[PDB]
Tab-separated table of C-alpha atoms in Angstrom:
chain	number	residue	atom	x	y	z
W	1	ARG	CA	52.936	67.458	86.003
W	2	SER	CA	56.038	66.346	84.428
W	3	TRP	CA	55.529	62.975	83.929
W	4	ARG	CA	52.183	63.950	81.273
W	5	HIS	CA	54.887	65.878	79.157
W	6	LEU	CA	57.264	62.873	78.722
W	7	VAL	CA	53.851	60.408	78.513
W	8	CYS	CA	52.235	61.852	75.731
W	9	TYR	CA	56.021	63.031	73.509
W	10	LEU	CA	56.092	59.474	73.883
W	11	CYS	CA	53.619	58.327	72.298
W	12	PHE	CA	53.046	61.839	69.885
W	13	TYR	CA	56.692	60.118	68.726
W	14	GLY	CA	55.544	56.723	67.936
W	15	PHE	CA	51.804	58.115	66.210
W	16	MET	CA	54.088	60.193	63.984
W	17	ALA	CA	56.498	58.057	62.883
W	18	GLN	CA	54.282	55.039	61.947
W	19	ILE	CA	53.207	57.605	59.147
W	20	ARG	CA	54.268	56.268	56.240
W	21	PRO	CA	51.758	57.396	53.163
W	22	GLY	CA	53.811	55.146	50.536
W	23	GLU	CA	54.771	52.109	51.983
W	24	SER	CA	51.647	50.058	50.934
W	25	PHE	CA	51.763	51.406	47.544
W	26	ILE	CA	55.872	50.495	47.049
W	27	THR	CA	55.618	46.799	45.590
W	28	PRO	CA	52.880	49.038	42.213
W	29	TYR	CA	55.317	51.349	42.245
W	30	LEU	CA	58.224	49.591	41.136
W	31	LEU	CA	56.203	47.748	37.952
W	32	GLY	CA	54.706	51.280	37.453
W	33	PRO	CA	55.000	52.435	33.835
W	34	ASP	CA	57.392	55.545	35.110
W	35	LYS	CA	59.628	52.340	35.698
W	36	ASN	CA	61.125	49.936	33.194
W	37	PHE	CA	61.063	46.829	35.724
W	38	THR	CA	59.995	43.719	34.599
W	39	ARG	CA	57.561	41.398	37.101
W	40	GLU	CA	60.211	38.223	37.032
W	41	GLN	CA	62.971	40.842	38.164
W	42	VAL	CA	61.490	42.117	41.383
W	43	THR	CA	60.196	38.673	42.410
W	44	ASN	CA	63.773	36.912	41.805
W	45	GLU	CA	65.894	39.444	43.016
W	46	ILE	CA	65.294	41.762	45.351
W	47	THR	CA	62.876	40.112	47.944
W	48	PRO	CA	66.282	37.584	48.693
W	49	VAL	CA	68.141	40.156	49.399
W	50	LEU	CA	66.092	42.117	51.273
W	51	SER	CA	65.222	38.170	53.192
W	52	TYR	CA	69.446	37.622	52.896
W	53	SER	CA	70.129	41.528	54.316
W	54	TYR	CA	67.433	40.669	56.761
W	55	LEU	CA	69.248	37.583	58.578
W	56	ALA	CA	72.638	39.452	58.009
W	57	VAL	CA	72.005	42.213	60.034
W	58	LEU	CA	69.505	41.276	62.808
W	59	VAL	CA	71.697	39.933	65.527
W	60	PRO	CA	73.744	42.628	65.025
W	61	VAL	CA	71.400	45.369	65.593
W	62	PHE	CA	69.777	44.031	68.841
W	63	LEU	CA	73.382	44.040	69.815
W	64	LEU	CA	74.343	47.321	69.251
W	65	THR	CA	71.083	48.198	70.768
W	66	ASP	CA	71.070	46.388	74.109
W	67	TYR	CA	74.793	47.581	74.670
W	68	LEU	CA	74.438	50.907	73.847
W	69	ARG	CA	71.739	53.537	74.332
W	70	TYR	CA	68.587	53.198	72.858
W	71	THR	CA	67.610	56.281	71.257
W	72	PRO	CA	70.734	56.064	68.716
W	73	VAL	CA	69.366	52.850	67.474
W	74	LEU	CA	65.963	54.963	66.710
W	75	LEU	CA	67.493	57.893	65.542
W	76	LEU	CA	69.161	55.161	63.063
W	77	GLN	CA	66.034	53.444	62.904
W	78	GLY	CA	64.338	57.131	61.382
W	79	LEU	CA	67.621	57.845	59.037
W	80	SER	CA	67.271	54.611	57.801
W	81	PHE	CA	63.334	54.844	56.768
W	82	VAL	CA	64.548	57.860	55.014
W	83	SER	CA	67.393	56.509	52.978
W	84	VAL	CA	64.849	53.857	52.121
W	85	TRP	CA	62.526	55.888	50.796
W	86	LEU	CA	65.487	58.369	48.802
W	87	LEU	CA	66.664	55.414	47.378
W	88	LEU	CA	63.038	53.985	46.252
W	89	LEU	CA	62.498	57.276	44.520
W	90	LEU	CA	65.981	58.184	43.512
W	91	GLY	CA	66.629	54.090	41.862
W	92	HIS	CA	67.718	53.974	38.741
W	93	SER	CA	68.385	50.500	38.260
W	94	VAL	CA	67.809	47.224	39.389
W	95	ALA	CA	70.992	47.077	41.646
W	96	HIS	CA	69.852	49.854	42.912
W	97	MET	CA	66.609	48.608	43.925
W	98	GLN	CA	68.902	45.587	45.796
W	99	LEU	CA	70.256	48.591	47.659
W	100	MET	CA	66.791	49.361	48.937
W	101	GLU	CA	65.843	46.299	50.104
W	102	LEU	CA	69.371	45.944	51.980
W	103	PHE	CA	67.932	49.291	53.168
W	104	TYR	CA	64.742	47.675	54.648
W	105	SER	CA	65.854	45.661	56.349
W	106	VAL	CA	67.514	47.058	58.932
W	107	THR	CA	64.607	49.555	59.564
W	108	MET	CA	62.763	46.215	59.963
W	109	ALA	CA	65.296	45.081	62.077
W	110	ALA	CA	65.013	48.047	64.638
W	111	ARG	CA	61.091	47.573	65.389
W	112	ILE	CA	61.262	45.827	68.551
W	113	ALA	CA	64.241	48.483	70.363
W	114	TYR	CA	61.205	50.854	70.479
W	115	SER	CA	59.473	48.232	73.365
W	116	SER	CA	62.466	47.710	75.276
W	117	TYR	CA	63.547	51.423	75.112
W	118	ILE	CA	60.188	52.185	76.829
W	119	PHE	CA	60.110	49.431	79.260
W	120	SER	CA	63.850	51.479	80.384
W	121	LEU	CA	63.028	54.722	80.782
W	122	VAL	CA	59.384	54.291	82.779
W	123	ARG	CA	59.749	53.292	85.940
W	124	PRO	CA	58.912	49.955	86.597
W	125	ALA	CA	55.815	50.623	88.889
W	126	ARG	CA	53.771	52.499	85.980
W	127	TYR	CA	55.358	50.510	82.914
W	128	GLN	CA	52.358	48.510	82.810
W	129	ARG	CA	50.051	51.294	82.201
W	130	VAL	CA	52.602	53.884	79.570
W	131	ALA	CA	53.562	50.407	77.865
W	132	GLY	CA	49.541	50.135	76.907
W	133	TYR	CA	49.271	54.060	75.934
W	134	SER	CA	52.411	52.913	73.394
W	135	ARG	CA	50.984	50.093	71.966
W	136	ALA	CA	47.784	51.924	71.601
W	137	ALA	CA	49.457	54.948	70.006
W	138	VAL	CA	51.665	52.703	68.035
W	139	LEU	CA	49.120	50.655	65.955
W	140	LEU	CA	46.495	53.350	65.494
W	141	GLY	CA	49.930	55.525	63.527
W	142	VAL	CA	49.879	52.043	61.571
W	143	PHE	CA	46.538	51.764	60.762
W	144	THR	CA	45.872	55.849	60.412
W	145	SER	CA	48.887	55.535	57.960
W	146	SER	CA	47.630	52.966	55.278
W	147	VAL	CA	44.316	54.555	55.470
W	148	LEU	CA	45.682	57.985	54.655
W	149	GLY	CA	47.960	57.646	51.752
W	150	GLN	CA	44.751	54.332	50.280
W	151	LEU	CA	42.044	57.285	50.979
W	152	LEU	CA	44.913	60.179	49.180
W	153	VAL	CA	45.293	58.269	45.977
W	154	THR	CA	41.635	56.960	45.642
W	155	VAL	CA	39.840	60.109	45.537
W	156	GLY	CA	42.646	62.912	45.605
W	157	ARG	CA	43.649	60.656	41.988
W	158	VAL	CA	47.182	62.017	42.831
W	159	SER	CA	50.206	60.173	41.316
W	160	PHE	CA	52.343	57.077	42.710
W	161	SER	CA	55.653	59.818	42.522
W	162	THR	CA	53.601	62.216	44.134
W	163	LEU	CA	52.693	60.602	47.050
W	164	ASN	CA	56.344	59.154	47.788
W	165	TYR	CA	57.492	63.147	47.957
W	166	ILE	CA	54.232	63.450	50.332
W	167	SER	CA	56.103	60.603	52.620
W	168	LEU	CA	59.367	61.886	52.572
W	169	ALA	CA	58.195	64.995	54.543
W	170	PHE	CA	56.589	63.198	56.883
W	171	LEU	CA	59.294	60.657	57.560
W	172	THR	CA	61.611	63.350	57.665
W	173	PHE	CA	59.697	65.187	60.398
W	174	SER	CA	59.486	61.659	61.900
W	175	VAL	CA	63.510	61.691	62.431
W	176	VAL	CA	63.348	65.483	63.266
W	177	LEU	CA	61.022	64.619	66.332
W	178	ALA	CA	62.712	61.583	67.309
W	179	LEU	CA	66.300	62.990	67.549
W	180	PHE	CA	64.850	65.083	70.562
W	181	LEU	CA	63.529	62.202	73.057
W	182	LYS	CA	65.622	62.108	75.784
W	183	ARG	CA	67.969	59.339	75.891
W	184	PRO	CA	67.223	56.296	78.747
W	185	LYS	CA	69.846	56.922	82.385
W	186	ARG	CA	71.429	53.040	82.423
W	187	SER	CA	69.807	50.210	80.510
W	188	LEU	CA	72.458	47.736	79.729
W	189	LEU	CA	76.292	35.361	84.278
W	190	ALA	CA	75.890	31.931	84.825
W	191	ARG	CA	72.241	32.656	86.275
W	192	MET	CA	70.658	33.484	83.404
W	193	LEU	CA	72.340	29.722	81.616
W	194	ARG	CA	71.157	27.488	85.307
W	195	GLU	CA	67.110	30.252	83.738
W	196	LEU	CA	67.388	29.298	80.473
W	197	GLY	CA	67.587	25.478	81.307
W	198	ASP	CA	66.097	24.788	84.006
W	199	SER	CA	63.069	27.530	81.995
W	200	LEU	CA	63.680	24.713	78.434
W	201	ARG	CA	62.521	21.583	80.424
W	202	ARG	CA	58.400	23.111	80.504
W	203	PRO	CA	56.541	21.108	77.894
W	204	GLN	CA	54.172	24.290	77.610
W	205	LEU	CA	56.973	26.189	76.157
W	206	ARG	CA	58.777	24.133	72.863
W	207	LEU	CA	55.475	23.816	71.057
W	208	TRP	CA	54.763	27.218	70.881
W	209	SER	CA	58.342	28.557	70.483
W	210	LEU	CA	58.524	25.436	66.979
W	211	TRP	CA	55.338	26.950	66.706
W	212	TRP	CA	57.040	30.419	66.282
W	213	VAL	CA	59.472	29.300	64.396
W	214	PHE	CA	58.193	27.880	61.712
W	215	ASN	CA	54.656	28.985	60.985
W	216	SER	CA	56.061	32.801	61.279
W	217	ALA	CA	58.410	32.176	58.281
W	218	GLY	CA	55.615	31.353	56.504
W	219	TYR	CA	53.623	34.509	57.363
W	220	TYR	CA	56.414	36.461	56.525
W	221	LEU	CA	56.884	35.042	52.953
W	222	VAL	CA	52.986	35.677	52.441
W	223	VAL	CA	53.225	38.498	53.388
W	224	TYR	CA	56.207	39.273	51.254
W	225	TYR	CA	54.609	37.945	48.250
W	226	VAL	CA	50.981	39.095	48.167
W	227	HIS	CA	51.909	41.985	46.703
W	228	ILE	CA	53.366	40.827	43.922
W	229	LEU	CA	50.549	38.084	43.587
W	230	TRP	CA	47.774	41.013	43.660
W	231	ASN	CA	49.892	42.552	40.875
W	232	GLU	CA	49.639	39.728	38.378
W	233	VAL	CA	46.390	39.116	39.219
W	234	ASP	CA	45.304	42.522	37.619
W	235	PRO	CA	47.630	45.095	35.875
W	236	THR	CA	47.326	48.567	37.433
W	237	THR	CA	46.776	50.650	34.212
W	238	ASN	CA	45.145	53.441	36.165
W	239	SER	CA	46.460	54.262	40.080
W	240	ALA	CA	43.028	55.080	41.521
W	241	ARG	CA	41.889	51.056	40.151
W	242	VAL	CA	44.518	49.520	42.272
W	243	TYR	CA	43.188	49.382	46.914
W	244	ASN	CA	46.635	47.729	48.184
W	245	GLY	CA	46.293	50.397	50.951
W	246	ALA	CA	43.069	49.555	51.900
W	247	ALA	CA	43.451	45.482	52.625
W	248	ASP	CA	46.341	46.579	54.770
W	249	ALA	CA	43.944	49.467	56.848
W	250	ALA	CA	41.659	46.072	56.894
W	251	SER	CA	43.672	43.856	58.015
W	252	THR	CA	45.405	46.001	60.852
W	253	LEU	CA	42.179	46.688	61.774
W	254	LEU	CA	41.033	43.324	62.172
W	255	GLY	CA	44.045	42.132	63.464
W	256	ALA	CA	43.607	44.756	66.205
W	257	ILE	CA	39.673	43.221	66.881
W	258	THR	CA	40.771	39.687	67.195
W	259	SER	CA	43.764	40.138	69.179
W	260	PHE	CA	41.925	42.277	71.946
W	261	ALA	CA	39.661	39.191	71.529
W	262	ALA	CA	42.269	36.496	72.293
W	263	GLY	CA	43.054	38.063	75.831
W	264	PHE	CA	39.490	37.165	76.652
W	265	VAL	CA	40.067	33.557	76.545
W	266	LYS	CA	44.379	33.361	76.821
W	267	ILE	CA	44.065	31.254	80.170
W	268	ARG	CA	40.479	29.868	79.585
W	269	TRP	CA	41.551	27.954	76.455
W	270	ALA	CA	45.214	27.235	77.579
W	271	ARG	CA	44.675	23.410	77.976
W	272	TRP	CA	43.795	22.855	74.336
W	273	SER	CA	46.607	24.050	72.421
W	274	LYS	CA	47.503	21.774	70.595
W	275	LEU	CA	43.955	21.818	68.571
W	276	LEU	CA	44.290	25.243	67.998
W	277	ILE	CA	47.012	25.647	66.404
W	278	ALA	CA	46.003	22.814	64.319
W	279	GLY	CA	42.428	24.650	63.764
W	280	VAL	CA	43.968	28.134	62.258
W	281	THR	CA	46.730	26.339	60.383
W	282	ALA	CA	43.638	24.630	58.504
W	283	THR	CA	42.757	27.448	57.756
W	284	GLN	CA	45.795	29.207	56.913
W	285	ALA	CA	46.709	26.768	54.427
W	286	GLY	CA	43.009	27.282	52.972
W	287	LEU	CA	43.671	30.757	52.408
W	288	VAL	CA	46.904	30.283	50.862
W	289	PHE	CA	46.028	27.787	48.352
W	290	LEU	CA	42.752	30.220	47.552
W	291	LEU	CA	45.062	33.037	47.027
W	292	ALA	CA	46.810	30.273	44.375
W	293	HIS	CA	43.762	28.821	42.655
W	294	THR	CA	42.316	32.491	41.727
W	295	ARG	CA	43.060	33.785	38.356
W	296	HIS	CA	40.069	35.283	37.351
W	297	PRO	CA	40.273	39.001	36.428
W	298	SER	CA	36.865	39.757	38.221
W	299	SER	CA	37.791	38.160	41.529
W	300	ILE	CA	40.356	40.099	42.250
W	301	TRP	CA	37.965	41.642	45.914
W	302	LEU	CA	37.648	38.042	46.684
W	303	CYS	CA	41.444	37.824	46.392
W	304	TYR	CA	41.844	40.841	49.015
W	305	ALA	CA	39.085	39.568	50.806
W	306	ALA	CA	40.979	36.000	51.092
W	307	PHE	CA	44.299	37.525	52.296
W	308	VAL	CA	42.657	39.809	55.298
W	309	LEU	CA	41.154	36.828	56.656
W	310	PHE	CA	44.530	35.245	56.238
W	311	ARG	CA	46.398	38.057	57.619
W	312	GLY	CA	43.602	38.173	60.563
W	313	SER	CA	44.077	34.759	61.409
W	314	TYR	CA	47.775	34.863	61.607
W	315	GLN	CA	47.653	37.287	63.873
W	316	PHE	CA	45.075	35.923	66.213
W	317	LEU	CA	47.463	33.370	66.886
W	318	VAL	CA	50.413	35.478	68.485
W	319	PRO	CA	48.861	37.053	71.646
W	320	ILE	CA	48.290	33.796	72.614
W	321	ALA	CA	52.061	32.541	71.982
W	322	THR	CA	53.174	35.791	73.943
W	323	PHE	CA	51.729	34.713	76.721
W	324	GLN	CA	52.818	31.485	77.466
W	325	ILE	CA	56.137	31.869	76.203
W	326	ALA	CA	56.458	34.977	78.975
W	327	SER	CA	55.350	33.433	81.572
W	328	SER	CA	57.983	30.794	82.779
W	329	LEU	CA	61.123	33.160	82.071
W	330	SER	CA	61.466	36.613	83.652
W	331	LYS	CA	61.918	40.351	82.156
W	332	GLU	CA	65.421	39.988	81.284
W	333	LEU	CA	65.317	36.288	79.678
W	334	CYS	CA	62.589	37.145	77.631
W	335	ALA	CA	64.593	39.648	75.299
W	336	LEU	CA	66.859	36.368	74.826
W	337	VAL	CA	64.520	33.831	74.667
W	338	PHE	CA	62.269	36.200	72.162
W	339	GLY	CA	65.738	37.251	69.999
W	340	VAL	CA	66.885	33.314	69.314
W	341	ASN	CA	63.696	32.274	68.409
W	342	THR	CA	63.303	34.980	65.420
W	343	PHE	CA	67.164	33.896	64.263
W	344	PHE	CA	66.000	30.718	63.812
W	345	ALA	CA	63.050	31.901	62.096
W	346	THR	CA	65.382	34.123	59.517
W	347	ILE	CA	67.265	31.336	59.087
W	348	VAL	CA	64.786	28.884	57.713
W	349	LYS	CA	63.227	31.647	55.869
W	350	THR	CA	66.049	32.704	54.071
W	351	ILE	CA	66.252	28.923	53.222
W	352	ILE	CA	63.075	28.577	51.795
W	353	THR	CA	63.478	32.043	50.285
W	354	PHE	CA	66.778	30.517	48.858
W	355	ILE	CA	65.496	27.069	47.366
W	356	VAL	CA	62.349	28.090	46.022
W	357	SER	CA	62.580	32.072	44.905
W	358	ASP	CA	66.566	32.640	44.357
W	359	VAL	CA	68.620	32.893	40.940
W	360	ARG	CA	70.845	30.034	40.780
W	361	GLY	CA	68.339	27.737	41.560
W	362	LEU	CA	64.433	26.714	41.196
W	363	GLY	CA	63.840	30.366	40.580
W	364	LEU	CA	60.005	29.489	39.975
W	365	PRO	CA	57.399	32.106	39.350
W	366	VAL	CA	55.774	33.630	42.215
W	367	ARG	CA	52.415	31.590	41.047
W	368	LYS	CA	54.067	28.045	41.732
W	369	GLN	CA	55.430	29.537	45.155
W	370	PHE	CA	52.574	29.926	46.414
W	371	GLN	CA	50.558	26.794	45.159
W	372	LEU	CA	54.369	24.956	47.016
W	373	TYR	CA	53.390	27.508	50.340
W	374	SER	CA	49.966	26.018	49.957
W	375	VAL	CA	51.343	22.642	50.452
W	376	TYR	CA	53.889	23.458	53.677
W	377	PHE	CA	51.090	24.719	55.444
W	378	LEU	CA	49.354	22.051	55.135
W	379	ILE	CA	52.217	19.912	56.028
W	380	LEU	CA	52.481	22.150	58.644
W	381	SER	CA	48.741	21.724	59.951
W	382	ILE	CA	49.164	18.208	59.272
W	383	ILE	CA	51.991	17.480	61.452
W	384	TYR	CA	49.555	19.589	64.297
W	385	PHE	CA	46.652	17.640	64.274
W	386	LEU	CA	48.734	13.838	64.184
W	387	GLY	CA	51.093	15.111	67.647
W	388	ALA	CA	46.940	16.575	68.936
W	389	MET	CA	45.911	13.046	68.142
W	390	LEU	CA	48.695	11.231	69.552
W	391	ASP	CA	48.387	13.186	72.308
W	392	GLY	CA	44.465	12.813	73.153
W	393	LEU	CA	45.559	9.192	72.857
W	394	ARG	CA	47.137	8.860	76.018
W	395	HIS	CA	44.775	11.364	77.687
W	396	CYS	CA	41.627	8.628	77.693
W	397	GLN	CA	44.221	5.529	79.079
């Protein structure tokens, strides 16, 4: 009886909090006529601050979430989203946008807290069902937010400034709603070290761990800079012409459908893993190279298709990795295993972005940067293919 109230309220809160209309249109807004911002300043100054701040903030945020009750951190995440949008709306110089990226890193940092919170509150026996409902609700919210924003701008022909104002009310409502949710009762050691040592010896785990470390950072870099590349391809003379949100919605739908597929044959494809990684990485590298090589104004639709295909391809691979990693370990150690992996991936991403894009260095523009990322992904694919071939060589004997 009373259980249903919280069961629906958690899903409602998640769905409402994923309603960010202007998130996908932030990059065009920065380059819009109303703001005297150059593309090179955006590409060389802002996102490096995002990456560095993410690396700086990750570990303390997770440790605070685990030590403290989750509800404070969830409220902090909502408040951080509010602050990010306020700074974006009132940003007046490059330093303001740098601070905005600093705050947005915090919001990005606490996304994983939600799953742990839901796991803590719900009874262990009923955890699976409620977790599935929550994942469905949050994915639906993410899918509908971009659709709502893009449809509002496209046919409504509303200006960009209006869109962010509309988004602000939704963010305020999200934080207000989040404030109410009840805090978990009680979710607060050589055994952990022994378990980590024992599990680490497993062969299957290391491959996926390295994949998560490197390919994840590459994918995140591509995701960050793709919007700037799109703006470079075509000027946004008219607000309606842009369809950034539509690509995000399509990518969300494709990722959902393909992730559904992974579970269908996750076990049946366990034996063949290196070859699968090589094949997927090859397609990702080809798509990145295609994005880099497209310069004609009228091919923009094909660029959108390549991007949605790339994001879908990356999304397809995640569930298999999560399943393979989780099986050996236990719930207690899973969060630590994921956290360490995430931290190493962020360190790698920080190094790469500081080298390629950060000032006081190469500082290459977006085009050559994507051209370099293409070679990076191709090298990863070649390494995986060579490893698979070496493994197969012994199998014959």
